[PDB]
Amino acid sequence: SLNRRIQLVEEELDRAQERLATALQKLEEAEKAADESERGMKVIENRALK
Amino acid sequence: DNDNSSARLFERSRIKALADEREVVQKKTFTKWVNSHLARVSCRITDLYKDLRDGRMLIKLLEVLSGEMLPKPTKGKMRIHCLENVDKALQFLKEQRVHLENMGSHDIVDGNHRLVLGLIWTIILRFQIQD
Amino acid sequence: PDSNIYKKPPIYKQRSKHLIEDLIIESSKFPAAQPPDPNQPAKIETDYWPCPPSLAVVET
Amino acid sequence: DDDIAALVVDNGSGMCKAGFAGDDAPRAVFPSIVGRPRHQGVMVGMGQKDSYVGDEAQSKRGILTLKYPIEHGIVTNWDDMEKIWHHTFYNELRVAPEEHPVLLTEAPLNPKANREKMTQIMFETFNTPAMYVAIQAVLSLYASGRTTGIVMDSGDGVTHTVPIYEGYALPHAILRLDLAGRDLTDYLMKILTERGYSFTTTAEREIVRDIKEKLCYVALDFEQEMATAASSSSLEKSYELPDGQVITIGNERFRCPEALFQPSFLGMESCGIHETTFNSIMKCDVDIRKDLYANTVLSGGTTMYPGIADRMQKEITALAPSTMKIKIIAPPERKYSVWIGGSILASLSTFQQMWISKQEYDESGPSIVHRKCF
Numbered sequence: 001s002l003n004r005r006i007q008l009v010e011e012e013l014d015r016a017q018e019r020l021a022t023a024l025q026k027l028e029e030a031e032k033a034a035d036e037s038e039r040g041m042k043v044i045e046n047r048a049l050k
Numbered sequence: 051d052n053d054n055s056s057a058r059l060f061e062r063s064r065i066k067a068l069a070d071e072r073e074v075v076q077k078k079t080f081t082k083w084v085n086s087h088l089a090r091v092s093c094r095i096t097d098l099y100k101d102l103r104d105g106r107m108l109i110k111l112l113e114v115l116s117g118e119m120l121p122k123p124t125k126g127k128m129r130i131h132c133l134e135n136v137d138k139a140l141q142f143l144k145e146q147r148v149h150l151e152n153m154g155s156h157d158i159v160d161g162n163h164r165l166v167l168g169l170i171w172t173i174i175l176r177f178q179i180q181d
Numbered sequence: 182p183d184s185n186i187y188k189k190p191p192i193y194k195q196r197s198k199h200l201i202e203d204l205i206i207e208s209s210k211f212p213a214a215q216p217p218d219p220n221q222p223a224k225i226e227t228d229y230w231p232c233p234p235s236l237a238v239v240e241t
Numbered sequence: 242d243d244d245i246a247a248l249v250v251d252n253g254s255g256m257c258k259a260g261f262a263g264d265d266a267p268r269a270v271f272p273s274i275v276g277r278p279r280h281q282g283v284m285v286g287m288g289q290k291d292s293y294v295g296d297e298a299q300s301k302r303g304i305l306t307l308k309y310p311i312e313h314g315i316v317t318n319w320d321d322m323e324k325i326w327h328h329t330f331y332n333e334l335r336v337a338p339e340e341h342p343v344l345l346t347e348a349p350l351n352p353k354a355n356r357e358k359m360t361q362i363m364f365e366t367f368n369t370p371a372m373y374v375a376i377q378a379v380l381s382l383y384a385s386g387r388t389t390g391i392v393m394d395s396g397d398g399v400t401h402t403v404p405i406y407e408g409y410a411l412p413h414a415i416l417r418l419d420l421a422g423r424d425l426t427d428y429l430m431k432i433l434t435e436r437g438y439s440f441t442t443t444a445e446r447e448i449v450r451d452i453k454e455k456l457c458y459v460a461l462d463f464e465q466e467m468a469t470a471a472s473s474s475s476l477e478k479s480y481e482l483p484d485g486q487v488i489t490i491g492n493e494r495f496r497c498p499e500a501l502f503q504p505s506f507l508g509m510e511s512c513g514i515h516e517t518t519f520n521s522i523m524k525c526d527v528d529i530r531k532d533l534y535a536n537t538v539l540s541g542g543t544t545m546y547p548g549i550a551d552r553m554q555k556e557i558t559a560l561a562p563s564t565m566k567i568k569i570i571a572p573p574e575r576k577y578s579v580w581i582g583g584s585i586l587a588s589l590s591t592f593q594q595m596w597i598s599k600q601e602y603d604e605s606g607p608s609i610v611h612r613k614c615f
């Protein structure tokens with residue numbers, strides 16, 4: 001019985017690690033898009049103030 | 051291109067935010083309503099999506115609301131037994147001529163939010179409680 | 182429609198001169214020749230089953 | 242306050258949208274397909290489900306045949322439409338249909354029995370207190386916020402152009418063309434055979450539709466684009482099938498939308514969409530054409546290809562006299578614009594006088610919709 005129990009817990013751990021990795025990558029992409037947004041913000045602000 | 055990005059922003063913000071706001075509030079209301087009726091058997095659910103997967107709690111809720119004796123739950127721990135129990139609950143609902151559309155055992159077992167909430171709403175609206 | 186299928190009897194179910202051997206025939210039906218313990222759980226849910234269980238039960 | 246928000250349900254050939262009156266965006270959007278199993282079921286013990294509706298039909302598209310109840314703006318199988326409406330009311334919005342009035346949309350020119358049948362179904366099966374039928378192109382002009390203009394709406398089944406001047410519509414200048422996204426999807430399935438890719442069944446039609454949504458655009462000049470594509474392989478893209486195989490379409494990116502402007506590729510004698518818009522403008526009176534040229538409004542999901550606005554502006558400017566200006570008004574969220582217009586129609590104070598009551602239906606039969614709806 002303990003062999004199958006350890007198998008189940010190990011599979012769940014591997015799945016959780018995969019989900020954590022893809023969440024971190026998505027967070028990096030979101031931060032990069034947020035930076036590009038404020039770049040566009042000041043260039044449009046310069047055009048409008050002229 | 052850019053217009054596609056703007057449309058993606060519009061849908062992803064507005065439609066998703068309004069939809070899941072409504073599901074959150076309705077889920078809390080439905081969870082409280084179910085917990086009101088399930089105290090007679092002294093069973094309590096903390097999450098509406100997770101606790102209805104195995105089908106035992108749906109059978110007990112129908113047991114309380116109908117007041118009649120449903121058949122035996124299938125003794126098991128697998129996916130097949132969960133499908134069997136949810137199918138038994140849906141068959142008892144079909145016995146009372148309660149009209150459900152797009153309702154399957156695998157949908158309730160897999161944990162679809164919209165279909166579980168719709169099933170609870172159909173239980174509240176169309177099903178009548180015996181006293 | 183509106184037909185309940187689980188509370189029907191089994192289809193094969195729908196259809197003296199010795200006492201001593203009849204009780205032995207009755208006892209031979211169960212997987213062990215004695216009847217099982219009523220409050221002991223069955224082998225399906227005793228956590229000794231070799232097949233893996235569903236995700237929801239493990240989560241709970 | 243005793244004001245109950247009226248459900249707004251936009252029904253098209255492709256997708257069904259649903260929400261409440263006064264909201265900014267629809268709560269539920271899902272494809273309008275009904276699927277049925279096509280293989281043997283051997284795992285006894287699982288539940289039985291006769292039909293699949295909406296997103297669940299798309300999720301399990303492998304083992305199902307999918308049928309659209311609405312074809313060319315006309316619904317053919319009414320039972321599937323009833324199933325879709327039941328799923329919308331009970332599983333998507335979680336509301337009781339007898340509490341709220343329901344506003345429905347339809348194409349301008351269609352068989353007269355459709356309005357009567359939806360009126361009868363909504364008043365008998367769903368027990369709604371009131372209902373109304375509106376034309377989608379007028380709702381686009383509500384969503385634009387301008388009283389006058391010409392509205393072209395192209396969806397999954399039908400294309401139609403109407404002119405309106407100061408809230409007055411000209412019924413003789415309304416034009417309907419039966420060219421839409423489904424014909425473009427079929428043409429893309431046909432022309433993908435040249436590169437060696439074969440798509441036959443309905444799930445493959447959904448895959449080809451996704452490919453068309455991802456990798457299609459409209460060329461400003463068709464001959465220039467063809468020469469450029471023949472010269473070099475810079476104008477190529479790669480798509481990944483669900484089974485892991487990679488396809489490369491290349492030249493076929495701008496040939497599928499070109500059938501919108503030249504319907505001779507599909508064997509149709511009828512003219513293009515720009516020609517239809519110009520003919521609808523020319524059918525109007527003389528001194529409103531000046532206002533109609535400057536207020537051209539695009540709507541529908543079919544008008545979402547990149548480069549449609551510039552190409553249509555160039556073609557209409559070629560047709561129109563050079564002395565006055567033509568501009569194309571394409572909002573970024575045009576795909577939902579029809580529904581948005583309906584919400585505004587459900588918010589006005591005078592529109593509470595325009596509902597078709599249940600007592601009026603009981604007196605007048607299903608024919609009241611022709612009297613009380615445009």
Ligand SMILES: Nc1ncnc2c1ncn2[C@@H]1O[C@H](COP(=O)(O)OP(=O)(O)O)[C@@H](O)[C@H]1O
Nearest residue numbers: 253254255256396397422454541542543545546
């Ligand atoms: N972003 C897009 N780019 C290109 N074509 C699209 C896009 N979105 C949707 N379509 C096409 O438009 C159709 C959907 O149109 P829709 O607005 O749903 O029509 P209706 O609402 O009248 O049914 C789809 O069949 C698809 O082929």
